[PDB]
Amino acid sequence: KNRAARVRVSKGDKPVTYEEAHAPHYIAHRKGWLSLHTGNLDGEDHAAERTVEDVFLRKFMLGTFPGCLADQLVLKRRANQLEICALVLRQLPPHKFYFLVGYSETLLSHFYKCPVHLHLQTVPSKVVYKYI
């Protein structure tokens, strides 16, 4: 049985995001790519760099906004700037959200030496595609 990136069937109560309900063989068919950048195209360079950068961003964001991250991150890279886009549960007061927006954007901008944008979309509770 393939197990990769799967959410197994429970007794039938389990809430499952649109993302988690689709096994890897559905990529580019039904669900799309959680990142976008030029690097993996035919004649292009520095794929490796962008991969590591990506991994660090998911980890970092997950730790910077504890408990409030709804679904996995979306990373768009365009002409030297990265727009991070996130689905966020409403947990914190908007004070904490703006504090973390600014803190993050500046921090990562100085880390990766490129302009970083952060776009928060706010959601009452984890959007539910299936079971439940």
């Binding site: 590591v52 660090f56 970092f60 730790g63 910077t64 504890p66 803190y103």
Partner: protein, 99 residues
């Protein structure tokens, strides 16, 4: 092959800036060596790794400044606390064997 052809060729090399005088197959390697970027100098090589020290250090500090939250390190901690409580800890250096 003629003398005319060889004079022409010599002129072609001298002009386009390739090797003028006749060389061995074995010696041309020298030119190759300076034409290129030596392997250990390519960014794909010396820059291969991310600096793991900077990532680990920076995110550690940012944890202590209470910005970043590391659940892995937290897990490690709580496990360890419960382990020293149960009585099996890490021996202070030098103590364990002989005692």
């Amino acid at each position: 092959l003629s003398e005319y052809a060889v004079r022409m060729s010599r002129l072609s090399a001298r002009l386009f800036g390739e090797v003028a005088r006749p060389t061995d197959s074995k010696s041309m390697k020298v030119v190759k060596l300076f034409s290129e970027q030596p392997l250990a100098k390519r960014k794909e090589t010396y820059d291969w790794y991310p600096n793991h020290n900077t990532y680990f250090a920076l995110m550690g500090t940012l944890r202590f400044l209470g910005l970043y939250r590391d659940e892995h390190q937290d897990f490690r901690d709580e496990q360890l606390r419960l382990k020293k409580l149960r009585g099996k800890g890490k021996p202070r250096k030098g103590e364990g064997k002989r005692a």
